[PDB]
């Protein structure tokens, strides 16, 4: 960098020496002289995520592979942009990267593609779908603010009757799906591609991957109706019997 050698020789700069960059400011016309003289809402706005991006996120180590994929973690990793003002209601998956994304991990997405589900399951990953209320999901993305408000964790909502069939569908692998069909369903997906189905139970971390929260439960770690001692870095659980009845209600 010979430019630095120029700087050392040159004299000390002063305030007056400052000069605007070339073409930074355009000229203007003034009237002093003759120059200027004379003269859809119902449909959920699902937000997609590319598997190639998922491979990019996984390959770059942006999201910990050991931890199961969590939408909140993706928000913490700035993977996708969700705006409550946009009234985003859903999150979905993408079939892109089907041939360049060879990895297995547990994940939960509001919406999943049938083709993508088998491919990740073929690698050995676990995919499920859960329903988050758009208002509740906004709280999920930003848990700290409601702690500042002092609000307690509410019970997770359930889908409207329009979307119940999708979540209840076994092939969709929703939390409302019948677990009894899953062993049969997984074989059918394996048969469709024809790949040898790897049993999840064989995995050493099977329990960690298969862990799922209650439908009422917003958070894997935290049960609904809980409170957090943010000041003391602790978790507070209600001890009132009526509160338990309220949660049951």
């Amino acid at each position: 960098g010979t430019s630095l050698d120029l700087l050392r020789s040159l004299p000390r700069v002063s305030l007056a020496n400052l000069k605007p960059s070339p073409n930074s400011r355009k000229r203007e016309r003034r009237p002093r002289d003759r120059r200027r003289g004379r003269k859809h809402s119902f449909r959920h706005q699902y937000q997609p995520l590319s598997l190639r991006r998922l491979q990019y996120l996984i390959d770059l180590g942006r999201v910990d592979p050991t931890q199961p994929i969590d939408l909140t973690q993706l928000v913490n990793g700035r993977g996708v942009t969700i705006q409550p003002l946009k009234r985003d209601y859903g999150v979905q998956l993408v079939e892109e990267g089907a041939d360049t994304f060879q990895a297995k991990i547990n994940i939960e997405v509001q919406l999943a593609s049938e083709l993508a589900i088998a491919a990740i399951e073929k690698n050995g990953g676990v995919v499920t779908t859960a329903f988050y209320d758009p208002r509740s999901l906004e709280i999920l993305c930003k848990p700290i603010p409601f702690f500042l408000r002092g609000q307690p964790i509410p019970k997770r909502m359930l889908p409207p009757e329009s979307l119940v069939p999708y979540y209840t569908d076994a092939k969709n692998r929703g939390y409302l799906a019948d677990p009894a069909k899953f062993p049969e369903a997984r074989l059918e997906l394996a048969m469709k591609f024809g790949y040898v189905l790897p049993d999840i139970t064989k995995d050493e971390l099977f329990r960690m991957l298969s862990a799922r929260k209650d439908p009422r439960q917003i958070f894997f770690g935290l049960a609904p109706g809980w409170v957090v001692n943010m000041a003391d870095k602790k978790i507070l659980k209600p001890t009132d019997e009526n509160l338990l009845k309220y949660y049951s209600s």
Binding site: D59, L60, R62, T100
Partner: peptide, 17 residues
Amino acid sequence: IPEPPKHKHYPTPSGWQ
């Protein structure tokens, strides 16, 4: 931003090197 993790084989399956 986390630094890229060490990989046994390059290029990475995505293709980053």
